[PDB]
Design a protein around this ligand. Structure first.
Ligand SMILES: CCCCCCCCCCCCCCCCCC(=O)OC[C@H](COP(=O)([O-])OCC(O)COP(=O)([O-])OC[C@@H](COC(=O)CCCCCCCCCCCCCCCCC)OC(=O)CCCCCCCCCCCCCCCCC)OC(=O)CCCCCCCCCCCCCCCCC
Ligand SMILES: CCCCCCCCCCC(CCCCCCCCCC)(CO[C@H]1O[C@@H](CO)[C@H](O[C@@H]2O[C@@H](CO)[C@H](O)[C@@H](O)[C@@H]2O)[C@@H](O)[C@@H]1O)CO[C@H]1O[C@@H](CO)[C@H](O[C@@H]2O[C@@H](CO)[C@H](O)[C@@H](O)[C@@H]2O)[C@@H](O)[C@H]1O
Ligand SMILES: CCCCCCCCCCC(CCCCCCCCCC)(CO[C@H]1O[C@@H](CO)[C@H](O[C@@H]2O[C@@H](CO)[C@H](O)[C@@H](O)[C@@H]2O)[C@@H](O)[C@@H]1O)CO[C@H]1O[C@@H](CO)[C@H](O[C@@H]2O[C@@H](CO)[C@H](O)[C@@H](O)[C@@H]2O)[C@@H](O)[C@H]1O
Ligand SMILES: CCCCCCCCCCCCCCCCCC(=O)OC[C@H](COP(=O)(O)OCCN)OC(=O)CCCCCCCCCCCCCCCCC
Ligand SMILES: CCCCCCCCCCCCCCCCCC(=O)OC[C@H](COP(=O)(O)OCCN)OC(=O)CCCCCCCCCCCCCCCCC
Ligand SMILES: CCCCCCCCCCCCCCCCCC(=O)OC[C@H](COP(=O)(O)OCCN)OC(=O)CCCCCCCCCCCCCCCCC
Ligand SMILES: CCCCCCCCCCCCCCCCCC(=O)OC[C@H](COP(=O)(O)OCCN)OC(=O)CCCCCCCCCCCCCCCCC
Ligand SMILES: CCCCCCCCCCCCCCCCCC(=O)OC[C@H](COP(=O)(O)OCCN)OC(=O)CCCCCCCCCCCCCCCCC
Lengths: 82, 172, 106, 50, 90, 56, 481, 45
């Protein structure tokens, strides 16, 4: 049950990450770091806010911020080295 | 669009429905003063269906100032409401309403006729490829349509533009 | 509601057990837990001889309310038991023979 | 269901031929965990208050 | 006097095959629960709750999505939009 | 013959070779589907992959 | 040849008594033949290549070289070639997955299975509306008979569903096809984008075509037949139905609808997006409260088809490529899951209720590994073709309509929920008390599942390997002025 | 010292099959690339 909780919450983060990937590909035409960082400063700020909100929701799930954190304390069901 | 006279047409429909219910009652009697006692309310069935359909149809047509299948959809909804009130159950009432409305809306969409409108039909219409620069009629086909017609019908955006992109973005 | 019966016995012994488990769960310090246990003992001792039905029923109800007021979010449970963290961990397999399901294929 | 009674399937705390509620899948062991300490409404009050 | 031909010899339909040992211990309660859930459509009735879920999911939700999808058609263009520029076309 | 072979092999856990019913189940077992599949279907998928890679 | 080969078939039947070896051999030959065709297929051309015509009046029983073409047309381009390769890959596995569990009228069963496979394969070759429709309906009698005779307990209702729902949609498809026939007097797919019908007529024809697509894909709200038909079908029926017959719908959109009714499609696209978002969200949620294994696997396919549709009507090259790749990956993965639930577990225990199953890892670790791999593949793990398809489809959908596509990105989560909720209970816990120990997955079952897994992995790590066949197609259907 | 379960050969049938196929495919790829470099077109083309 703890494993299911963790995988599902991180899949929530991943759904928002996929939303972010779609918008990045549409807006910049690519996923490479070099191009995105080369042409970031010229992009409309609403689009950047959309991208960054999606990616931040993903990282929030991953980094167990208070929105998506319950799995963090269920994960100690696994072995201590894990 | 000039109006239907809702009051008059509904009155004639009341008369027709009453007569039809009378005929159905006489038949019902013959097949089974008791004719109306053992009628099963068929006179009321006919009268109510007639008044509901005609009144709602004319009402809707006058209010929307249009003549199309939607008026028949409303009228079928009213007729189904009348016929499903006889069940005395809310689910059945709703089902009669929506389904009779849908069936009559389909009927009105196809032309509100059981036989065909011969002059509008494909067999009696200009068909095939059109000539030099003629306007497209319903059954005719071309090899290329005018871009202004596309922009007006479909609407601007979503890749629909007045000018092809490559032409518009050409440098000089 | 008997003043002294086997069912009364079982009920009050269970409640007294409970009270003690609650006290252990609530108090981290051992010495302090000891004084809480002895106070709980004295409090049960005092009301031991109640006889009339109304007063005994009221006292039992009130003590149930007290225990419910002082229930702990997470009781201490050893690892190998239902609430425990070892529970069902590496459950040894049931030793079994394979039943076949198909004449041609294992 | 207290876990010290014996059951035919101890992990699911079910005995054989026990009748199943129509909404059983919401009440078995695999169902989302329920917590008894605070009432649901009360826990909502605390969460929103914090 | 009307009887099938005596010429016909009828035997049993046997399906053959190897009767495997029965590897599942059927639980009657589970089977009844499964049958009830499987044929729930035969017993469905329109009530206040059931009608409420019907009118939500088959009517209200489609209407919401339709309003969104027809209101927003062609509204956005994002490819390479820069600062100060409108991401909206209308 | 099929029936006798497989019924014995299933209700004895013994193979009908070697001639009285030995237990030597390690090897000498070939199912009938394996020749066709392994020697035609698998090469065909390998060929498809090669062709796609080189048509790319 | 045909006379001699018929003699060979007859003799093999008389001596061996079970046709199934001959059918397996035949299907493998067909696969090899299609691969030879792929070798000789020119990819630097957007023209149909291996053309032939049947039932022409000058030569009713042969091929036609006449200057008047009144027969049925067949031929392939890259788009048809992709699905044909998928079909010939899947057919022998469909034969093999029932190699031992059919012990009665087995010859008839294998005949029906191979006939259905051949019908679908030929359907992909069709080049005009009438032959497409003919081969599109020809499966329904075979599916009806197969499901009725070789199905599980509730198979009669299943057979009636699979016939009736598909007929219901197909007849409205027939209305649209009849309108096209009488308006254009042509039916071919070769030059049907050259005819520009009036917008109103396009809007009317589109309705019949899309009603057929709703029933066959399926899409919400007329999807309720599929879970039944799947659960009571025998394994071959379920594998074929999930892996090919649904992709027939997507191929139908691309081939019949988009080139002819472009402007009407542009008008109707938001309605399509409403229906696809409905099917994704609502069927994914409804999957949570199912108690049958095969029913849950069936419900998964509908959601993946919803994502496919969102991709294919996106009016972008990426969306179409994603829809195709997702179709192929689904044709790899879903037959594998159906193999598990309806051929391994069902043939060992003859039950499909979820409550009975638990903790299968202890006795059958290999089956548990297969379940884990296939489930993470089904929910769209990268380096699997399913992920590429869902990602590209979602890109196209987000471009076509940012709000609707953004909301559709919830499919990743929803798919994870139902699939992992299933596999959690199946793999772990203490071994069930209701069932006893049985054999682990055998060599045949492992062979089939390995084929499907390696196929999906190969196209998941390098989805580009399909591009040589599809780079014309990704431009042949998008409508930008 | 931990206990010792029975011996098992390193190279199983599946090891042989999968390793042989994969290595043969890589060798075939390299052979085609080299045969391209010399003949000016790959042996498969
Ligand atoms: C690079 C080139 C690679 C290309 C592919 C190679 C695959 C080879 C397969 C094989 O060997 O044959 C076995 C296969 C049948 O498998 P089987 O072994 O007989 O199974 C029966 C028993 O299970 C077998 O007996 P068992 O029961 O004991 O086995 C149990 C099972 C275990 O039970 C399980 O639970 C299995 C769990 C799932 C495993 C299956 C997934 C496979 C994952 C692959 C590995 C992942 C690695 C991660 C990524 C790395 C990328 C390389 O074992 C397995 O099956 C797992 C196999 C893993 C073996 C790994 C060992 C490799 C050794 C490497 C050594 C390296 C040498 C270096 C030295 C250097 C010196 C210079 O037969 C075939 O030949 C199939 C032909 C198909 C080939 C690929 C398909 C291409 C065409 C498909 C369509 C193309 C695209 C779609 C188009 C659609 C229409 C257009
Ligand atoms: C809209 C306004 C409707 C307002 C009426 C609500 C309605 C229609 C719902 C249809 C939804 C349509 C959706 C379709 C798509 C929409 C686009 C559902 O009302 C339901 O409410 C449910 C919950 O209250 C009840 O379920 C359970 O109930 C309890 C049992 O223990 C539990 O308390 C509850 O817990 C359960 O859950 C149902 O029994 C009840 O029918 C009908 O309710 C009422 O209408 C009448 C007349 O027909 C019905 O017949 C009446 O009673 C009959 C003897 O009874 C006799 O014939 C007669 O005396 C009379 O005629 C009754 O049905 C009545 O009740
Ligand atoms: C897959 C779902 C199936 C369900 C949908 C099918 C319903 C079809 C509706 C479409 C359609 C037939 C199209 C058939 C095409 C193939 C048939 C498809 C398969 C058949 C199953 C029926 O159109 C009907 O629509 C009804 C309203 O809903 C009207 O109802 C009635 O309204 C009131 C009376 O005036 C009354 O008050 C009452 O009698 C009803 O209220 C009918 O009068 C009307 O005929 C339209 O046909 C007609 O359209 C017009 C202009 O379009 C065409 O002429 C055009 O003239 C100029 C402008 O006029 C244009 O400049 C010119 O270019 C063009 O020449 C015609 O040539 C003709 O073709
Ligand atoms: C801000 C809002 C936060 C949103 C977080 C994402 C919600 C999905 C997470 C689902 C989940 O993790 O449930 C896992 C649940 C295990 O929970 P539990 O039983 O308490 O674990 C015991 C282990 N110690 O195991 C289960 O119950 C699985 C059963 C299905 C769980 C999902 C049910 C669907 C309900 C809607 C989910 C969210 C929908 C999109 C938002
Ligand atoms: C498997 C089984 C599959 C079965 C599929 C469903 C079959 C039919 C079920 C019942 C549907 C009944 C449809 C009634 C529609 C009511 C109506 O009056 O339609 C008329 C409407 C407008 O028509 P018109 O007069 O030409 O106005 C032009 C303005 N632009 O015309 C329209 O604009 C169309 C309105 C309905 C759109 C389609 C509805 C679903 C099909
Ligand atoms: C019952 C449902 C309704 C039935 C409607 C239709 C029934 C049709 C019956 C099946 C017959 C079709 C298959 C054989 C026709 C093709 C024969 C042929 O020779 O191919 C012609 C084509 C061009 O050849 P050619 O111009 O002569 O040049 C040769 C150069 N060396 O050469 C080629 O390019 C090769 C073409 C390969 C075609 C692959 C076909 C895939 C499946 C083959 C068998 C399908 C049988 C279906 C049985 C179920 C019924 C659908
Ligand atoms: C419900 C079920 C519905 C079933 C539907 C299936 C209909 C089957 C009709 C079969 C006709 C289609 C045959 C495909 C043509 C393949 C072919 O070419 O066969 C060879 C020969 C004619 O060949 P030819 O015209 O010379 O062209 C070759 C040049 N390289 O062709 C011949 O000589 C004719 C031999 C075929 C005879 C078939 C007779 C009916 C079958 C009993
Ligand atoms: C016909 C031409 C194309 C056929 C292609 C394959 C030829 C060989 C078929 C075969 O292998 O045998 C078929 C089947 C098995 O033979 P057998 O073992 O003798 O049957 C057991 C009892 N004797 O023989 C039989 O058992 C026959 C039993 C018939 C089953 C009756 C119901 C099936 C109806 C099929 C649906 C057809 C509907 C047609 C509509 C359009 C279909 C495209």
């Amino acid at each position: 049950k703890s494993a299911l909780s963790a995988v599902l919450m991180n899949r929530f983060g991943d759904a928002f990450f996929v939303l972010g990937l779609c918008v990045i590909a549409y807006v910049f035409g690519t996923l490479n770091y070099s191009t995105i960082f080369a042409t970031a400063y010229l992009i409309n700020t609403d689009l950047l806010v959309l991208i960054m909100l999606a990616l931040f929701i993903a990282a929030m799930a991953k980094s167990a911020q208070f929105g998506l954190h319950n799995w963090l304390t269920l994960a100690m069901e696994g072995p201590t080295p894990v | 669009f000039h109006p239907y006279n809702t009051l008059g047409l509904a009155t004639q429909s009341a008369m027709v429905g009453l007569g039809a219910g009378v005929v159905a009652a006489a038949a019902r009697n013959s097949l089974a003063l008791t004719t109306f006692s053992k009628s099963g309310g068929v006179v009321t069935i006919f009268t109510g269906a007639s008044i509901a359909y005609v009144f709602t149809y004319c009402s809707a047509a006058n209010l929307r100032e249009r003549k199309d299948g939607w008026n028949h959809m409303w009228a079928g909804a009213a007729t189904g409401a009348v016929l499903g009130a006889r069940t005395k159950l809310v689910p059945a009432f709703i089902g009669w309403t929506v389904l009779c409305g849908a069936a009559c809306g389909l009927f009105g969409w196809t032309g509100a006729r059981f036989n065909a409108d011969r002059k509008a039909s494909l067999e009696q219409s200009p068909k095939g490829f059109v000539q030099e620069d003629a306007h497209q009629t319903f059954w005719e086909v071309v090899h290329r349509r005018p871009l202004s017609l596309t922009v007006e019908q479909l609407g601007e955006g979503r890749g629909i533009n007045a000018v092809p992109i490559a032409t518009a973005t050409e440098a000089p | 509601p008997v003043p002294f019966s086997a069912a009364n016995k079982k009920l009050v012994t269970s409640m007294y057990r409970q009270s003690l488990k609650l006290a252990r769960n609530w108090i981290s310090n051992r010495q302090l837990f000891r004084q809480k246990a002895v106070e709980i003992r004295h409090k049960f001792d005092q009301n031991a001889q109640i006889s009339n039905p109304r007063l005994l029923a009221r006292t039992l109800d009130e003590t149930r309310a007290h225990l419910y007021e002082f229930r702990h979010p997470d009781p201490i449970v050893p690892p190998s038991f239902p609430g425990g963290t070892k529970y069902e961990r590496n459950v040894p397999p049931r030793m079994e023979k394979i039943m076949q399901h198909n004449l041609y294929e294992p | 269901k207290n876990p010290y009674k014996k059951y035919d399937d101890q992990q699911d705390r079910r005995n054989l031929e026990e009748p199943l509620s129509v909404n059983d899948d919401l009440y078995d062991m695999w169902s989302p965990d329920r917590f008894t300490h605070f009432k649901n409404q009360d826990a909502l009050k605390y969460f929103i208050g914090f | 006097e009307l009887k099938p031909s005596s010429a016909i010899q009828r035997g049993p339909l046997n399906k053959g095959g190897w009767d495997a040992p029965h590897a599942l211990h059927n639980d009657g309660a589970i089977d009844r629960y499964a049958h009830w859930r499987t044929f729930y459509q035969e017993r469905f009735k329109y009530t206040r709750a059931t009608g409420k879920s019907t009118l939500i999911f088959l009517v209200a939700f489609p209407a919401l999505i339709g309003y969104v999808a027809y209101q927003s058609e062609g509204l956005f263009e994002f490819a390479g939009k820069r600062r100060g520029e409108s991401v909206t076309t209308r | 013959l099929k029936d006798y072979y497989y019924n014995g092999r299933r209700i004895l856990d013994k193979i009908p070779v070697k001639v009285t019913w030995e237990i030597k189940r390690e090897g000498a077992e070939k199912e009938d589907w394996v020749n066709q599949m392994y020697f035609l279907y698998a090469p065909s998928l390998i060929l498809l992959l090669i062709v796609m890679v080189y048509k790319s | 040849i045909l006379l001699s080969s018929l003699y060979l078939f007859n003799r093999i039947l008389a001596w061996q008594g079970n046709v199934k070896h001959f059918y397996l051999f035949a299907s493998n030959l067909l696969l090899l033949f299609i691969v030879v065709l792929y070798i000789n297929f020119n990819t630097f051309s957007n023209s149909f290549q291996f053309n032939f015509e049947l039932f022409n009046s000058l030569n009713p029983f042969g091929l036609s070289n006449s200057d008047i073409s009144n027969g049925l047309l067949f031929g392939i381009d890259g788009l048809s070639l992709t699905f044909i390769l998928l079909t010939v890959l899947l057919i022998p596995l469909t034969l093999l997955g029932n190699w031992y569990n059919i012990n009665f009228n087995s010859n008839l069963y294998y005949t029906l299975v191979l006939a259905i496979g051949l019908v679908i394969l030929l359907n992909f070759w069709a080049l005009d509306y009438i032959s497409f429709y003919i081969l599109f309906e020809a499966t329904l009698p075979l599916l009806f008979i197969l499901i009725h005779i070789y199905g599980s307990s509730d198979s009669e209702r299943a057979s009636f569903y699979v016939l009736m729902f598909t007929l219901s949609g197909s007849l409205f498809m027939l209305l649209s096809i009849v309108v096209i026939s009488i308006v254009l007097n042509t039916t071919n797919f070769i030059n049907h984008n050259l005819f520009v019908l009036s917008l109103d007529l396009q809007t009317i024809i589109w309705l019949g075509l899309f009603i057929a697509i709703m029933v066959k894909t399926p899409l919400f709200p007329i999807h309720v037949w599929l879970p039944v038909v799947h659960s009571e079908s025998p394994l071959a029926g379920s594998m074929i139905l999930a892996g090919l017959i649904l992709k027939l719908a997507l191929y139908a959109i691309l081939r019949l609808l988009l080139p002819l009714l472009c402007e009407a499609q542009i008008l109707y696209t938001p309605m399509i997006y409403i229906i696809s978002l409905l099917t994704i969200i609502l069927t994914s949620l409804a999957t949570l409260r199912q108690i049958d294994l095969k029913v849950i696997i069936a419900y998964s396919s509908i959601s993946h088809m919803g994502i496919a549709i969102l991709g294919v009507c996106s009016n972008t090259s990426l969306g179409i490529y994603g829809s195709i790749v997702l179709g192929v990956a689904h044709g790899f993965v879903s037959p594998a899951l159906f193999l598990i639930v309806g051929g391994i577990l069902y043939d060992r225990y003859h039950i499909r209720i979820v409550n009975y199953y638990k903790g299968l890892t202890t006795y059958m670790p290999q089956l548990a590994t297969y379940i884990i791999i296939l489930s993470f593949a089904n929910i769209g793990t990268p380096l699997t073709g399913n992920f590429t398809g869902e990602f590209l489809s979602l890109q196209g959908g987000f471009i076509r309509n940012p709000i609707i596509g953004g909301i559709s990105c919830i499919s990743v989560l929803l798919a994870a929920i139902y699939q992992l909720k299933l596999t959690n209970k199946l793999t772990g816990g203490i071994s069930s008390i209701y069932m006893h120990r049985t054999n682990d997955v055998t060599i045949r079952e492992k062979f089939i599942m390995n084929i499907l897994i390696i196929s999906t992995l190969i196209i998941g790590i390098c989805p580009q390997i399909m591009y040589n066949l599809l780079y014309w197609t990704v431009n042949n259907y998008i409508y930008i002025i | 010292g931990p206990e010792l379960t029975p011996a098992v050969p390193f190279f199983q049938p599946y090891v042989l099959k999968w390793a042989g196929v994969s290595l043969g495919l890589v060798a075939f790829y390299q052979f085609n690339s080299s045969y391209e470099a010399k003949n000016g077109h790959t042996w498969v083309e």
